[PDB]
Ligand binder design. Structure first.
Ligand SMILES: O=C1N2C=C(c3ccc(O)cc3)N=C(Cc3ccccc3)C2=N[C@@]1(Cc1ccc(O)cc1)OO
Ligand SMILES: [Ca+2]
Length: 189
């Protein structure tokens, strides 16, 4: 995993703008934590049939993750401030990860995978990633989900584990590590 960021690369700014536009479903150029948490709980966790405890751990993780970016309940955040907030989060999490500490991005990954994980493996299958991908919308075709798995280093079960997805996410969301390109197939640039 690379530890240096590339905040000035328009490709990194545009990757987040793409995701901002994806979250800005009502098209008003603003995002609220309310909207984000609703997507996490009322939409994704509900459709996944998550348990009360899983739903709550997942909501806490999504909340902490996006609060670090500067989102809050009842606060509208526009794109320039949103991407400046990713700088806070990126430095925060890269520091933690490099010191073998739990990062907010790892915590989110644990919460998502836990919904699917029935054996304590902290790993998910291709079909489970297809499910999460289609319900959240971030991997909206089976081919893209397949690309994620082809892209990553899978474990002895052909499954994606949380440590591997965390490393990939550091590079994809935080540092623009070229090794992380294609993480979400052809969807997220
Ligand atoms: O990767 C994660 N994502 C990053 C962004 C995102 C949004 C805006 C940006 O500027 C940059 C990235 N949006 C969503 C989908 C989502 C958004 C809000 C609430 C619930 C789900 C998302 N789902 C994840 C969940 C996850 C986390 C860690 C793992 O190890 C495995 C799976 O994959
Ligand atoms: Ca909006």
């Amino acid at each position: 995993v690379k530890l240096k960021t590339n905040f000035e690369d328009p490709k990194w700014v545009n990757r987040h703008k793409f995701m901002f536009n994806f979250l800005d479903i009502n098209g008003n150029g603003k995002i609220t934590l309310d909207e984000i948490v609703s997507k996490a709980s009322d939409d994704i966790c509900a459709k996944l049939g998550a348990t009360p405890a899983q739903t709550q751990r997942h909501q806490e993780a999504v909340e902490a993750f996006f609060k670090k970016i500067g989102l809050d309940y009842g606060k509208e955040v526009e794109f320039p401030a949103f991407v400046n907030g990713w700088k806070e989060l990126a430095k925060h999490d890269l520091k933690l990860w490099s010191q073998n500490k739990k990062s907010l991005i790892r915590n989110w990954g644990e919460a998502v995978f836990d919904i699917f994980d029935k054996d304590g493996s902290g790993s998910i299958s291709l079909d489970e990633w297809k499910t999460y991908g289609g319900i959240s919308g971030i991997c909206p075709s089976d081919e893209d989900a397949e690309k994620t798995f082809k892209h990553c280093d899978l474990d002895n079960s052909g499954k994606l584990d949380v440590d591997e997805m965390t490393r990939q996410h550091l590079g994809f969301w935080y540092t623009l590590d070229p090794n992380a390109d294609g993480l979400y197939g052809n969807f997220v640039p």
